[PDB]
Write a protein that binds this DNA or RNA. Structure first.
Ligand code: MG
Ligand code: MG
Ligand code: MG
Ligand code: MG
Ligand code: MG
Ligand code: MG
Ligand code: MG
Ligand code: MG
Ligand code: MG
Ligand code: MG
Ligand code: MG
Ligand code: MG
Ligand code: MG
Ligand code: MG
Ligand code: MG
Ligand code: MG
Ligand code: MG
Ligand code: MG
Ligand code: MG
Ligand code: MG
Ligand code: MG
Ligand code: MG
Ligand code: MG
Ligand code: MG
Ligand code: MG
Ligand code: MG
Ligand code: MG
Ligand code: MG
Ligand code: MG
Ligand code: MG
Ligand code: MG
Ligand code: MG
Ligand code: MG
Ligand code: MG
Ligand code: MG
Ligand code: MG
Lengths: 131, 188, 155, 167, 260
RNA sequence: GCCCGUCGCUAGUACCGAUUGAAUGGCUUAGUGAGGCCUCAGGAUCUGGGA
RNA sequence: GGACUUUUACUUUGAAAAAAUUAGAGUGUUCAAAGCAGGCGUAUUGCUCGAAUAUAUUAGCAUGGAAUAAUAGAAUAGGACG
RNA sequence: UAUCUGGUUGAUCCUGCCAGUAGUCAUAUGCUUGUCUCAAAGAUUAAGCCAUGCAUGUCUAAGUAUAAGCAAUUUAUACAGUGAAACUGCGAAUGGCUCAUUAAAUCAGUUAUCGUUUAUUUGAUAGUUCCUUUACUACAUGGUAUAACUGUGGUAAUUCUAGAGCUAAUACAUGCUUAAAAUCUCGACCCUUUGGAAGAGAUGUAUUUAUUAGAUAAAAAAUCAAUGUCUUCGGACUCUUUGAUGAUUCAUAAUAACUUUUCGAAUCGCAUGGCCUUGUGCUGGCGAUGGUUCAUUCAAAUUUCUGCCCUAUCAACUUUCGAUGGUAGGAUAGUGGCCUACCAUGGUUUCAACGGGUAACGGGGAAUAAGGGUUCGAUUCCGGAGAGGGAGCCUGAGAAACGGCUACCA
């Protein structure tokens, strides 16, 4: 009788299961940003996929439609916030661009590597996971 | 119990309908009072939500009014003589709404001869005054005046005895008296 | 439907509580009651002129009209004092993104204030349940007779 | 063990539907009737006991019967019932005649009398007085509120005859 | 379902209460009273969820059984008493008066009001009839029977009331151009004058509304509560005066007030 | 080269079939008909016609 | 207030509307799924932003349009206005 | 978030399916398993069966205390604290569980009650009770009969109870009361009129019946039968009052009666004050419980428009023993073939009636991501239905109730 506890899942798994290419392209990413799954890359491209979908859907309404200005502007300010989207390309046909790497680059595991503090991406992974 | 639901009972297309739910009590019916003439006997019945209907099983008086004379009296009810729903009501002298009864007259007589000072059929001061006042207003009506001779007046029960324990009516008059008289003889 | 007699029943027919004092010699015999159903519907003169009885007349009886006002086409008049209209209408199946012809018949009471024949478009009004099926009452004829008299003999 | 039930007649057992206010049955719930076995009202050899009531004494005392008396438990408590267990007139002040029952508390002999009921008192008179007074005061109230309207109405008509001679 | 329902699961609860999903499974079913179930703010909700005064529900009973809180003047104990639009909640301790009156989002706001104004309410007369002894009477949206009103007083008009005593001390008719509060629909809490009414004989009269921002909108009549003249409201309003800003207009206000 | 049918072996499915074959479920005629409710009587007892 | 109105389809806008769900704004639950919180200070007797928005169509209601597609009309004139 | 690959041939292009592939709040099972948070879970099969324990009881200053109960003290010789038992009151009709039945049924959205019932909460609401009306009615307050208890008992056995003796009320059952006034009926007398008059009865509300009023579509006149207010005695009538609705025989009120007569406080807690003619007179504070009627609020019941899966190897269906409509009635809370009586012959259907199937509760929704679709919803919210199967009923505001009863079947 208690209200429902809500949940969603947060990843999506490749259509074709043995594309040699996506595989390499995947491994390398985990290799550079110090990831452990293929899921850590699945999650992000899922994240990326819906964001684009919103974008896509917004550009179909004509310019300066309220929802477009509300939700569009919203989506951009929120992206720039965490450092994915360039200050200049800031009008959402580049939120339409936006590869996975841009998202990857902003993890506290990478930040904690990029200004030294760890030296090697994994050392960062460990220090973080170690308080 | 008796049940007034429509969920028995074929559809307009004449289809047959599954039994859906058991009988609820709020769609209940009860049995007829089938009220007769005789020394008074009424039973209350507890209806929905507190509340009472009085089921009259036996009624011998009723308060009947002579509409054109603007009065009512309480008379004995002589009997049932015509019923449009079912002849068996007449035969068994059953009182229901719309039944045609005969009553007593002699309270309506004791009023009329006292009020018009005139006597139906065939010396005070204020009275004489009052009777003189009332005239061109005393001319009764043939078919109704001719009723007092037998001492019995035709009246239509207007109440619902099995509902309220009252058996109440109105003396028959004018065009409506014609109808039922024509029936009472064109059958005799 | 009625037609004729008026006193054709076992019970004497009358309008409830519409007394006529036999003592007062009058010209109209029976005092008659009537009203207008409202909502702008004229009460036809045949209701005020007539002497028919009907306790299910919306102008001379004890019903009220409140709720759906619908119109339909008359398709049966074999019942005495009540009819059946057909209300046709189109129904939108999506998926195929078009419509199909549907209908329903609707049984409705019909005061002898109106003379209805089959084919007449009629406007009916919502009723307290009047009978087992009937929940509507004819309330204007938006028709006439469908040009029958312009179907006659020969030159 | 099954009890007799007055008036069944029969010298056998049967099973009746018993209701409230009926003998050999204590209903557990409102409007509850339980069907129960009952013994007839005619004495048979199958009886374990016979309940008996003396109505005329004989020519000798029965040991623990005639010879001994056991006192009534409770005394009168409703005002008038005290009045009539001493035959007293509405004059003799029941307050004295209410029964008194001693009882000792180790070394305290204590006393406790009923709470006499339906006794007329200063208090109940103050409440019968207030009733009547209030009925009227309201009645007066209503009238004063009534005509105070009638006016509002009358000097509206005395404005619709200043609106009809104006225009 | 054999008798009157006595419980109220959450989720089934009216949303303008702002009750939260978890932390339970039931919401305090509003008592029987002077306001419809789905348009009330039970004491338990206002004394705890709005005013943050009590923590437990248990404390709300304990706060209340001090004859502390009192609605429209009478004292009121019912934990789940149905309080509603135009009423006057009052705390003698903490010398505090409140009117119940709507937000713009659609909710009952917290609304401090003066002692002076705390002594009189407004009621939409919802019907007027003849009673026994030919005594006419009006009844108002908060279940108030008031005998002997003005003849001029007809239905949909609004009424000022002594609370302290029983009576009507002024009234306001329903005319084109009259300050109007909106109690229902997606236009609940908005306020604006009245352009005109659409008749529609036998089925929902309509009411066109124009606010002090030159925006126009309709709500079914019944949903309209007249409350004064353009300018003069016969009661103190809440901030924002029921004018409804677009999500954008608000986003810009909300982050205009941004520089600490 | 391909390939058709009868006839023969193993295994499986479904059909037909004496048994007026069998089983479960839903309605249902006719006959019998509990029990509460209503109703005509009844009067164990227990009082002022009633219970 | 009276006296009377040929029928429809379509389409626009709007009312009347349950919440959770979905889409989606706001808020850094340490992240996230979530949650509807929270955020400022004189952190010793308080200040404060919130708890949006959308979709909710078939039907019924309400309003704009009068293309497209039906319907009805005056020919034995029992036509229309006065 | 618009993708295809493998398999027929010697090779080729097709058609076309099998296979692969990915998801699933989609179940099971195998193997493996460390941390945080979150948290479904005897639906599917058998709405099969159930050992045992628990799931419904409840007291304020404020209905009832002689516990032969506890307590002492603090005025309390009627009662006074506290309080088992028990009476009384209210609740047990909510909740929770399940998805068997159910296909125009439920259910949704949308309607209707001018077609009804409604504990309670909230707001209004009651001077009328008796009697042929001076030797007079308990109202300073009228009746008993009951539990608990006491004591005698019965049965292997139960939330079994019998006989005897007590005693309470907001249980039961009775039964008084109050202003002024007007208007109606009757009318002893007197006197002739143009006619008037003491003074007598009746008039709370509710019930049942009949008769009225409840105007309004813009304005005027004569006459009959009655008969109202003021005479400058031919006459005049002059101001003359009216609620709501789209709509009514609505709200309301009036007349004549009716009733095994509805309600109109025989109740309780705190405080104790005024007021003289010192009657323990007569007054009087705060607020509880009640109480009719109306409203409101929580409801309920019926109900309008449209909308359901597969099926013609279901084409005609419906009235026996109501099928469709009319009149009357009876029954209901109330409409209504809901039932009866009389009468008629209707009602539905290829725009799919009627019948069959559903491994069918309906919705909110769920899964699958170009779109269009496809499939799923026993199951956290709403509605409905059920309590082993049927039926029947008591109590009550509300049950056709099942942790109520009665009967049959298992
Ligand atoms: Mg016929
Ligand atoms: Mg007492
Ligand atoms: Mg339930
Ligand atoms: Mg509550
Ligand atoms: Mg309406
Ligand atoms: Mg055999
Ligand atoms: Mg009978
Ligand atoms: Mg729309
Ligand atoms: Mg929302
Ligand atoms: Mg091959
Ligand atoms: Mg090959
Ligand atoms: Mg080769
Ligand atoms: Mg496959
Ligand atoms: Mg389950
Ligand atoms: Mg099961
Ligand atoms: Mg004691
Ligand atoms: Mg007795
Ligand atoms: Mg009582
Ligand atoms: Mg007139
Ligand atoms: Mg009027
Ligand atoms: Mg009436
Ligand atoms: Mg004193
Ligand atoms: Mg078949
Ligand atoms: Mg009939
Ligand atoms: Mg036939
Ligand atoms: Mg077909
Ligand atoms: Mg099923
Ligand atoms: Mg479901
Ligand atoms: Mg389905
Ligand atoms: Mg199942
Ligand atoms: Mg049930
Ligand atoms: Mg079972
Ligand atoms: Mg059976
Ligand atoms: Mg049952
Ligand atoms: Mg159980
Ligand atoms: Mg139960």
């Amino acid at each position: 009788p208690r209200a429902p506890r809500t949940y969603s899942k947060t990843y999506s798994t490749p259509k074709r299961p043995y594309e040699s290419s996506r595989l390499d392209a995947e491994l390398k990413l985990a290799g550079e940003f110090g990831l452990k799954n293929k899921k850590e890359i699945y999650r992000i491209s899922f994240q990326l996929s819906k964001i684009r979908r919103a974008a896509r859907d917004l550009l179909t309404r004509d310019e300066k439609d309220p929802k477009r200005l509300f939700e569009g502007n919203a989506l951009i300010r929120r992206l720039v916030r965490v450092g994915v989207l360039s200050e200049d390309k800031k009008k959402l046909d580049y939120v339409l661009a936006l590869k996975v790497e841009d998202f990857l680059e902003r993890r506290l595991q990478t930040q904690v590597y990029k200004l030294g503090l760890a030296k090697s991406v994994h050392h960062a992974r460990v220090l973080i996971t170690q308080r | 119990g008796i049940s007034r639901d429509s969920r028995h009972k074929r559809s307009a297309t004449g289809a047959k309908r599954a039994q859906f739910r058991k009988k609820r009590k709020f769609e209940l019916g009860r049995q007829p009072a089938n009220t007769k003439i005789g020394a008074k006997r009424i039973h209350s019945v507890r209806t929905r939500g507190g509340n009472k209907k009085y089921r009259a099983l036996r009624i011998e008086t009723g308060n009947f009014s002579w509409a054109s004379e603007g009065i009512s009296k309480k008379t004995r009810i002589a009997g049932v003589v015509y019923h449009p729903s079912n002849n068996e009501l007449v035969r068994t002298n059953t009182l229901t709404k719309a039944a045609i009864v005969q009553i007593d007259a002699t309270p309506f007589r004791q009023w009329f001869e006292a009020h018009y000072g005139q006597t139906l059929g065939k010396k005070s001061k204020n009275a004489e005054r009052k009777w003189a006042a009332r005239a061109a207003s005393a001319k009764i009506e043939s078919s109704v005046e001719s009723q007092f001779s037998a001492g019995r007046l035709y009246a239509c029960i207007s109440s619902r005895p099995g509902q309220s324990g009252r058996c109440d009516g109105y003396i028959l008059e004018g065009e409506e008296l014609a109808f039922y008289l024509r029936r009472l003889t064109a059958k005799k | 439907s009625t037609e004729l007699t008026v006193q054709s029943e076992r019970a004497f027919q009358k309008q409830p509580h519409i007394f006529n004092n036999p003592k007062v010699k009058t010209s109209k015999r029976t005092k008659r009651w009537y009203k207008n159903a409202g909502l702008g519907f004229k009460t036809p003169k045949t209701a005020i002129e007539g002497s028919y009885i009907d306790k299910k007349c919306p102008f001379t009886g004890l019903v009220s009209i409140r709720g759906k006002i619908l119109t339909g086409t008359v398709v049966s008049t074999k019942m005495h004092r009540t009819i059946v209209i057909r209300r046709a209408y189109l129904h939108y199946i999506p998926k195929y993104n078009r419509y199909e012809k549907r209908h329903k018949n609707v049984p409705v009471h019909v005061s002898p204030a109106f003379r209805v024949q089959v084919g007449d478009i009629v406007t009916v009004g919502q009723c307290r349940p009047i009978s087992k099926t009937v929940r509507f009452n004819v309330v204007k004829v938006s028709a006439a007779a469908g040009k029958a008299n312009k179907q006659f003999a020969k030159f | 063990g099954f009890p007799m039930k007055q008036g069944v007649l029969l010298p056998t057992r049967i099973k009746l539907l018993l209701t409230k206010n009926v003998s050999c049955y204590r209903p557990r719930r409102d409007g509850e009737r339980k069907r129960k076995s009952v013994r007839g009202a005619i004495v048979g050899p199958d009886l374990a006991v016979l309940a008996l009531v003396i109505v005329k004494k004989g020519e000798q005392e029965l040991e623990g019967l005639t010879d001994t008396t056991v006192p009534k438990r409770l005394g009168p408590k409703r005002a008038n019932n005290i009045r009539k267990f001493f035959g007293l007139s509405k004059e003799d002040d029941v307050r004295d005649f209410v029964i008194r029952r001693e009882v000792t508390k180790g070394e305290k002999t204590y006393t406790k009398a009923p709470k006499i009921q339906r006794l007329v008192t200063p208090q109940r008179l103050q409440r019968k007085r207030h009733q009547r007074a209030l009925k009227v005061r309201n009645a007066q109230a209503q009238r004063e509120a009534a005509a105070e309207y009638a006016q509002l109405l009358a000097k509206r008509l005395s404005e619709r005859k200043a609106e009809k001679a104006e225009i | 379902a054999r008798g009157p329902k006595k419980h109220l699961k959450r989720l089934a609860a009216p949303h303008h209460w702002l009750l939260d999903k978890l932390s339970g499974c039931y919401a305090p079913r509003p008592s029987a009273g002077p306001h419809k179930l789905r348009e009330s703010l039970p004491l338990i909700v206002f004394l705890r969820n709005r005013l943050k005064y009590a923590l437990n529900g248990r404390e709300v009973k304990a706060i209340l059984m001090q004859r502390h809180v009192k609605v429209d003047g009478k004292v009121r104990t019912d934990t789940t008493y149905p309080a509603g639009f135009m009423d006057v909640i009052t705390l003698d301790a903490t010398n505090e008066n409140f009117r119940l009156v709507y937000d713009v989002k659609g909710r009952f706001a917290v609304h401090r009001i003066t002692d002076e104004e705390a002594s009189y309410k407004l009621g939409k007369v919802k019907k007027v009839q003849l009673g026994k002894k030919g005594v006419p009477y009006v009844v108002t949206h908060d279940g108030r029977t008031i005998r002997y009103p003005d003849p001029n007083i007809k239905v949909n008009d609004t009424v000022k009331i002594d609370l302290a005593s029983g009576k009507i001390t002024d009234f306001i008719k329903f005319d084109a151009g009259k300050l109007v509060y909106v109690t229902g629909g997606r236009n609940l809490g908005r306020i604006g004058t009245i352009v005109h009414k659409e008749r529609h004989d036998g089925g929902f009269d309509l009411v066109h509304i124009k606010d002090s921002l030159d925006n126009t909108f309709v709500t079914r009549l019944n949903n309209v509560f007249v409350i004064g003249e353009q300018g003069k409201p016969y009661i103190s309003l809440p901030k924002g005066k029921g004018i409804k800003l677009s999500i954008a207009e608000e986003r810009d206000r909300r982050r205009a007030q941004q520089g600490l």
